[PDB]
Design a protein around this ligand. Sequence first.
Ligand SMILES: Cc1ncc(C[n+]2csc(CCOP(=O)(O)OP(=O)(O)OP(=O)(O)O)c2C)c(N)n1
Length: 203
Amino acid sequence: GLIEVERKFAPGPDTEERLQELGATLEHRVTFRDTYYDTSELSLMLSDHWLRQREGSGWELKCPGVTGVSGPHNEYVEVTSEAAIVAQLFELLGSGEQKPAGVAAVLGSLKLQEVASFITTRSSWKLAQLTIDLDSADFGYAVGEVEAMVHEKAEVPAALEKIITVSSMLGVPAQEEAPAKLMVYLQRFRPLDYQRLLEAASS
Ligand SMILES: Cc1ncc(C[n+]2csc(CCOP(=O)(O)OP(=O)(O)OP(=O)(O)O)c2C)c(N)n1
């Protein structure tokens, strides 16, 4: 799959106006459920893999990036082929000897269960490209991301530059590193999982 490069930010009262003034256009709005899966030991998340089923899109696996871009920014390979997702799940959790099947069909054999499920309403903008998604979660939390998707690693630096420039033109504090919706959900509603992630990040 493709390499996603992103920077999250806290959206302000002026964000639409600022986007308008930059020449970004609002492409669509959409409301949808995401459901994230892991083992009881959080084997995926602790290895920086994120498996989800998204209403309207199907199964998606985020795999850790190949280049060094972490900080307020981050980089993931997004895998959307179910066959590719299963192949990676077998390697991480099970055996490559297992019979391939759809992601839903293998969950039970790999002891994968729902760790999080929540609805989001997303207002999606395009800049000529970059995408800027302004999200509101159904547990009460709002976040934005400036994002680019590239094919090869050598395109990452140039994408990363635009992402920073656009966040800055939005007037988003440089220091700010707004958390992912999933991380706020885990903090509020899966506190023992959240602590496990904390203890592993400081390690
Ligand atoms: C402290 C910390 N923060 C973030 C991460 C990375 N991370 C946390 S959750 C998580 C999975 C959810 O990522 P997210 O960017 O919030 O998805 P979303 O915006 O809704 O959808 P999309 O852009 O595909 O449409 C990742 C990759 C990490 N490992 N540690």
